[PDB]
């Protein structure tokens, strides 16, 4: 029962990712270094 | 080659290194073979108590 | 052992070399082997096996 | 197996093609001597487009005018073999050819003469090994779709009739490309199996492939089975102890021993982004490992000061705070962070609630299923 009445109207990942992933934030490594120079002090 | 005294010599210090390094399993086996083949041939007092 | 009783006696002789070695391969067959496994020399090892 | 394709030669590329390290200089000599010794003229080509390089003229005619004269004179054998000798001499000379083809890069057309090869050629263990060309042709491109039917392919071979050596690389192989494509499970599963028999020395040393084992179990595995496969493996401890950094990685966790865990779980993400096969996932394994040390940190408290923690993970208060609310947010740990108190209290929920809610969960589906059904039957 095709419902004409609504019309029907790069990224070939093969793995499923959540949310978190597309946030952007310094890499892991930049921050825990970041955060040990400043409680090196 | 048949001296089989360095033979068992040289399983015995693979035996060691191979327990030195974590790897139980392949170690005892190295002994075990160095044990058959040392009750092939004549162990010395100073073998036998290496082996032992 | 007369033959009317008995009609046909087949002899079961030892394996012979083929007939070891398809022995075991029939035997090896649900076995892990690793390449480097040549069962004809394994075979060559055995003369005389009782099968 | 034979080391053609190079898998290392795709990864200097793919190291090249890093933003940081596009300029580096020694990978660049390391690919040069590669392309030179190997010459890969099709490759190089491509290459040079990709990363915008100077073609090197006479270089470049060198590598062209070798690898015509090789494919003339294995061509020329083909058709001895045709003419003269028999199917066999024609299966080798056909296979030859496309193992020339695939040393030079030309994927188009490697992939087209290892398909004539398998099409000519009626031995199960050649065919394994045209399918084994084609996975690690697949690898160095990174062809998912090549990837998925050849290892479809082998896996029927091997099903039909298969030594177990073919099955303990194709093992090795299929972890490579779930690490590649972010099934962590299937990788660890498949590494762990193999790292006892470890054959497949064209893919990658035998370090190499003990540290993607422990990160994937790692990233995989829970605790008792990655204390009974992993840090009492006899294999992957020998290993380690030729790799201090690994080693003391995989140690972190396992003793609790958080600080020298998140300097570890650092460098193993820098390391992991210069990787080519972890490069796509880096982010991601470190994201998870950090929710693992996290929860397995939280299993043996109820409520534990974000002091504390912070001083345990090396890090400041504000950090971790934020990091355990973004966390949260995403329902990955089972905790609320007390701010003011500053007190982290877990909500681990009984295993009858627990219990409760999966029954309701499945329950809920199966109902679903049961009226779509009940409606497209009663009519």
């Given at each position: 029962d095709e419902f004409e009445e609504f019309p029907a109207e790069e990224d070939a990942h093969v793995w499923e990712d959540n949310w978190d992933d597309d946030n952007v934030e310094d890499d892991f490594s930049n921050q825990l270094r970041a955060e040990l120079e400043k409680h090196g002090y | 080659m048949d001296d089989k005294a360095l033979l068992v010599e040289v399983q015995l210090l693979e035996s060691k290194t191979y327990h030195a390094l974590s790897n139980l399993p392949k170690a005892r086996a190295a002994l075990t073979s160095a044990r058959t083949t040392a009750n092939a041939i004549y162990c010395p007092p100073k073998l036998q108590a290496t082996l032992d | 052992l007369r033959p009317g009783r008995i009609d046909r006696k087949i002899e079961f002789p030892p394996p012979n070399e083929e007939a070891r070695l398809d022995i075991l391969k029939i035997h090896s067959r649900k076995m892990n082997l690793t390449?480097?496994?040549?069962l004809r020399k394994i075979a060559e090892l055995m003369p005389g096996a009782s099968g | 197996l034979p080391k053609n394709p190079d898998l290392r030669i795709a990864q200097l590329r793919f190291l090249l093609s890093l933003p940081e390290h596009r300029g580096d200089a020694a990978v660049r000599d390391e690919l040069m001597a590669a392309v030179r010794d190997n010459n890969m003229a099709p490759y190089y080509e491509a290459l040079c487009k990709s990363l915008d390089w100077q073609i090197d003229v006479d270089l470049l005619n060198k590598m062209k005018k070798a690898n015509e004269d090789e494919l003339k004179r294995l061509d020329e054998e083909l058709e001895d073999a045709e003419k003269n000798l028999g199917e066999s001499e024609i299966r080798d000379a056909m296979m030859a050819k496309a193992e020339y083809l695939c040393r030079i890069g030309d994927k188009e057309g490697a992939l087209t003469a290892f398909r004539k090869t398998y099409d000519k050629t009626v031995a199960l263990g050649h065919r394994l090994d045209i399918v084994f060309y084609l996975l690690r042709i697949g690898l160095f491109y990174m062809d998912n779709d090549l990837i998925t039917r050849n290892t479809e392919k082998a896996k029927s071979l091997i099903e039909e009739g298969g030594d177990w050596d073919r099955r303990n690389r194709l093992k090795v192989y299929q972890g490579l490309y779930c690490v590649a494509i972010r099934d962590f499970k299937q990788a660890a599963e498949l590494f762990l199996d193999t790292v006892s028999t470890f054959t497949s020395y064209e893919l990658m040393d035998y370090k190499t492939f003990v540290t993607y084992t422990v990160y994937v179990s790692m990233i995989a595995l829970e605790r008792p089975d990655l204390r009974e496969?992993?840090?009492?493996?006899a294999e992957i401890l020998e290993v380690l102890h030729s790799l201090p950094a690994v080693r003391q990685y995989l140690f972190s966790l396992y003793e609790c021993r958080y600080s020298v865990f998140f300097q570890s779980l650092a460098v193993v993400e820098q390391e992991m982004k210069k990787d080519w096969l972890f490069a796509p996932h880096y982010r991601y394994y470190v994201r998870e490992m950090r929710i693992h040390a996290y929860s397995q940190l939280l299993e043996s408290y109820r409520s534990l000061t974000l002091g504390y923690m912070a001083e345990a993970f090396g890090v400041g208060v504000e950090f971790i705070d934020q990091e355990l609310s973004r966390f949260i947010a995403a329902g990955r740990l089972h905790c609320k962070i007390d701010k003011v108190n500053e007190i982290v209290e877990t909500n681990r929920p009984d295993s009858k609630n627990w219990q409760y809610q999966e029954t309701i969960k499945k329950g809920d589906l199966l109902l679903n299923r049961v009226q779509k059904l009940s409606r497209v039957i009663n009519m």
């Open positions: - | - | 390449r480097g496994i040549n | 496969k992993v840090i009492k493996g």
